Design a protein around this ligand. Structure first.
Ligand SMILES: O=C(O)c1cc(-n2cc(CO)nn2)cc(C(=O)O)n1
Ligand SMILES: O=C(O)c1cc(-n2cc(CO)nn2)cc(C(=O)O)n1
Ligand SMILES: O=C(O)c1cc(-n2cc(CO)nn2)cc(C(=O)O)n1
Ligand SMILES: O=C(O)c1cc(-n2cc(CO)nn2)cc(C(=O)O)n1
Ligand SMILES: [Cl-]
Ligand SMILES: [Cl-]
Ligand SMILES: [Cl-]
Ligand SMILES: [Cl-]
Ligand SMILES: [Cl-]
Ligand SMILES: [Cl-]
Ligand SMILES: [Eu+3]
Ligand SMILES: [Eu+3]
Ligand code: NA
Ligand code: NA
Length: 129
């Protein structure tokens, strides 16, 4: 599923990501735009042989099982394919664990380089939330 911007903002808010660990909703929407273009089916392979999955590009090296990242962990205790669903519940619940691990949203490279420090509220401007 390719979400619209406000559609995804509403879903993330309903799932409790607005201000989670102090990160306002616009930070999450910005991160998802540049990680996945709001496409739940996005996948990208990393240099180490892990893969990033879903709207927030969650990595199989640490967070989910894909069966092909030998030596990896599965700290969200989920198959990586759950992160590709049109329902973002699994991606949100796993993201909550990632952003709590000590490094905040720096875990997301696109957030660090394209969202951090910017006017992220612009990403939810005009939405009825
Ligand atoms: O493709 C776009 O740029 C786009 C698409 C949508 N979409 C809205 C929906 C709902 O059915 N799907 N895409 C919203 C926006 C926007 O708020 O700027 N922008
Ligand atoms: O209506 C929109 O949501 C929309 C429209 C355009 N359009 C761009 C052009 C060409 O000038 N026409 N609509 C771009 C975007 C976007 O980049 O999010 N979004
Ligand atoms: O917190 C992370 O997972 C993270 C943070 C950084 N950061 C690097 C800097 C400063 O240059 N800030 N976070 C890089 C990486 C990575 O290569 O996977 N990962
Ligand atoms: O006006 C639009 O169509 C629009 C504007 C932005 N904006 C994104 C930013 C952040 O720099 N400001 N407007 C995003 C989108 C979209 O994601 O579809 N769409
Ligand atoms: Cl929308
Ligand atoms: Cl915001
Ligand atoms: Cl594996
Ligand atoms: Cl393969
Ligand atoms: Cl599994
Ligand atoms: Cl933080
Ligand atoms: Eu648009
Ligand atoms: Eu990292
Ligand atoms: Na906000
Ligand atoms: Na699993």
């Amino acid at each position: 599923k390719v979400f619209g911007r406000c559609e995804l903002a509403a879903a993330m808010k309903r799932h409790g990501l607005d201000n989670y660990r102090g990160y306002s909703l616009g930070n999450w929407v910005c991160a998802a735009k540049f990680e996945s273009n709001f496409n739940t089916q996005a996948t990208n392979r990393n240099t180490d042989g892990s893969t990033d999955y879903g709207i927030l590009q969650i990595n199989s090296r640490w967070w989910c099982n894909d069966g092909r990242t030998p030596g990896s962990r599965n700290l969200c205790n989920i198959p990586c394919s759950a992160l590709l669903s049109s329902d973002i519940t699994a991606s949100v619940n796993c993201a909550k664990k990632i952003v709590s691990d000590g490094n905040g949203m720096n875990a997301w490279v696109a957030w660090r380089n394209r969202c951090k420090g910017t006017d992220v509220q612009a990403w939810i401007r005009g939405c009825r939330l």
